[PDB]
Design a protein around this nucleic acid. Structure first.
Lengths: 98, 198
RNA sequence: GUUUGACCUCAAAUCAGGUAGGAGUACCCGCUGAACUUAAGCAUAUCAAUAAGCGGAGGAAAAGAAACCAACCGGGAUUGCCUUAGUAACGGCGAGUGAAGCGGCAAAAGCUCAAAUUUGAAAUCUGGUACCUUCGGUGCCCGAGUUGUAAUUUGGAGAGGGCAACUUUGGGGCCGUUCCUUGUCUAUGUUCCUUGGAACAGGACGUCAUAGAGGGUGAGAAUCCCGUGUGGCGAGGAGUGCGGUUCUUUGUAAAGUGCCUUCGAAGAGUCGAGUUGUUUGGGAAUGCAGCUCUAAGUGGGUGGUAAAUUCCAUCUAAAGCUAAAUAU
RNA sequence: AGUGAACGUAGGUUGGGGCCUCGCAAGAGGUGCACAAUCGACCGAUCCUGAUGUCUUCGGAUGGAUUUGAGUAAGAGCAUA
RNA sequence: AUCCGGGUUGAAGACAUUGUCAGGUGGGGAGUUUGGCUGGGGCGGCACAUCUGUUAAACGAUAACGCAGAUGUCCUAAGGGG
RNA sequence: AUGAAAGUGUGGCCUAUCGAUCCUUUAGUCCCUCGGAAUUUGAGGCUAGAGGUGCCAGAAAAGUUACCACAGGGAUAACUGG
């Protein structure tokens, strides 16, 4: 909700701000139940890539802070290095534990 | 190659501009072509207007938001409100914009009655029954003009509290400039020490 | 080791039917690419993302229905003009260059695939042959194709299942009118005198005029001729804009609409990152390209100062079709 | 980022055409546009001053400064040649 | 004129090759520059930014590759006060 | 600061001893900006310095031509004449 003056925080005119319906474009990347099943199975067959093995090696050797430092040069971004090192932590958990 | 005392000019003529000078002698010749082009389109589209019913829409950019204006196409929300289909609307002479969405009740209601007033005034011919000869009204957008809604009255009473509207704007600006710095000076000295303290 | 038959990949033929070059190039889509010149010198800059060179189209081309603009009370494909603006920005921050959004207007119109089990029936398509009512149609026959051709779905949605009521539809033949290509017809002084080779010149008396545009005729001709003006009557094409108009008849099959319930696939050597080169007004990098790396699924891009943490807004990339306003 | 033009008769002073008054006229007196000099006042900037207050660090009243501006102070401009 | 495998034969081998980026070398080649004043240019010089005295003709100004010289520093004292 | 004070002192008793933009760096300030909204680095700004241009109002720069060239010049040399 806006205040009603042309400077400040919510700024400006107070109208009936209510309301739209949700766009079907906005759920573009929704896991779903196909792509979940297909991505789960295609990882079974097969082969976590050579860098994905190196990151697993570095997680179990020198923790993260080095997994990510190397992942972000291997991948492009820091946001991607984070999510990669996080999925590597999860496969480490799902495989090594029990 | 510098003035007596003259303004420093920026005349951008160091390319081969002489090879792409475009003089509009064709203005009068194009004007009659556009009028003939309109007359022939109205003969083709025989009993129907040349332009489709446009919706009302408030202009963006705070400089211009003070005035309303004929937007591109109504909306899937306004079409459903007025009581017709986004397919049927396009065919019987209403611009429908799949993109635009409604976040404003005054614009929504304005456009919804604008669809209801258009539906009231048109008389849609049946597919194969009979053609009743209705002489064509050319400009639909001239039949349904864009009314800039008058949002106040002539004169009123001074419902005064005396808060100095200058001092109101100046404090509102200060609240903006120190919103984050006060949240930081409230996260330390106020809390993060009280979180340990009894 | 043989018998015959498949399949896959690759061949051959003066094999049945087809298609490509070349020309032109004003305008259009690309690639490649200078120097003169400007800077009072000159190497970055500039000329110029121009000339030249090469590849490729059409009557237009390209673009185009958002991985857009914005920050608003928000706008809503594309192109063009007016404006923004000689501005924000760039730049030996010198010379010089230099956009975009909003706003008014011109014209306006939207859409298609991939990813789904038709699976109680490849429903699909080329070809050959015969016959017909021949830009095609039907029967039969070989082939394509399940390594996926049709019906359904395109994000605005939508699909499956459930319940409940309606509401709307197709084909051609025949003139008129429509758009082009032409043909023909449609008034008025050649009266008098004078100079002259000729009167189309001067003077007199008229005539027509919706025709005194223009040209011809032995000198300046509305009235001598062709035409001009105004209407008319023809013939020949392109016909779906409509009117009249008559055979049907699709249909037992397709479309929109409401409430519930489960779902709701959405494009990868790509996006993105580093680096090199180029380019841009785009400045810790605007686009493009090479090389190395190379994602994700509440995901990805963008939000014009690099990053980290936190939110927010806005779109939906890596697949595609599309007249007019514009150029000439 | 911002802020934003009247202490006064829109100021005082010396000039100032023209007009008004007394006059025969010489003149004196008054009112004085433009413009000129000058002293001020007002707006923004810079340097301080730092009231009532208060999300206790925000707010910046109030009054100064051999500082500063292509400013205000009964609008002159736009279009065309 | 022996059977089997249909790996033509023999070298070389994850080096080299090629691709991209990076350092060196690179008048073989490309582009361009190569002060000024000046008793012609050049060789000298600086009269090119400054300072003293004279030229300079008793206000000021005043030239020449006129004359005699000077500057690109030095000093917490060689500054300030007593 | 000095001095009892009057006072004198904004470098050298006086006349010389020095340097733009752009760039970089420093000093100042509870400053402004990074434009969807926050914080901290980071960058950018505002006011005053410094790193320098001696061709000193401040290009980034070696020769050679007797193979030579063009625009000019008697503003200027090599011959005559005065």
């Amino acid at each position: 909700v806006k205040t009603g003056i042309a400077i400040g925080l919510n700024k400006g005119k107070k109208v009936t701000s209510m309301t739209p319906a949700p766009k079907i474009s906005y759920k573009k990347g929704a896991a779903s139940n196909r792509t979940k099943f297909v991505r789960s199975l295609v990882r079974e067959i097969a082969g976590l890539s050579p860098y994905e093995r190196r990151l697993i090696d570095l997680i179990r050797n020198s923790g993260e802070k080095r997994a990510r430092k190397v992942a972000k040069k291997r991948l492009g971004s820091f946001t991607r290095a984070k999510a990669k090192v996080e999925e590597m932590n999860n496969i480490i958990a799902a495989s090594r534990r029990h | 190659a510098i003035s007596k005392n003259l303004p420093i000019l920026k005349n951008h003529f160091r390319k081969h501009w002489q090879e792409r000078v475009k003089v509009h002698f064709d203005q009068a010749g194009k004007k009659v072509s556009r009028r003939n082009a309109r007359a022939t389109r109205a003969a083709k589209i025989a009993p129907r207007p040349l332009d489709l019913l446009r919706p009302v829409v408030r202009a963006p950019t705070v400089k211009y938001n003070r005035k309303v204006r004929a937007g591109r196409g109504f909306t899937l929300a306004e079409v459903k409100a007025a009581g017709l289909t986004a397919a049927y609307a396009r065919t019987i002479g209403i611009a429908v914009d799949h993109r635009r969405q409604n976040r404003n009740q005054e614009i929504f209601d304005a456009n919804v009655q604008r669809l209801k007033e258009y539906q009231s005034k048109i008389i849609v011919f049946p597919r194969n029954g009979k053609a009743p000869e209705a002489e064509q009204v050319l400009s639909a957008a001239a039949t349904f003009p864009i009314a800039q809604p008058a949002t106040d009255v002539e004169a009123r009473a001074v419902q005064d509290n005396g808060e100095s509207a200058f001092r109101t704007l100046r404090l509102a600006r200060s609240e903006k400039k120190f919103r984050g710095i006060r949240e930081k000076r409230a996260r330390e000295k106020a809390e993060a020490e009280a979180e340990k303290k009894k």
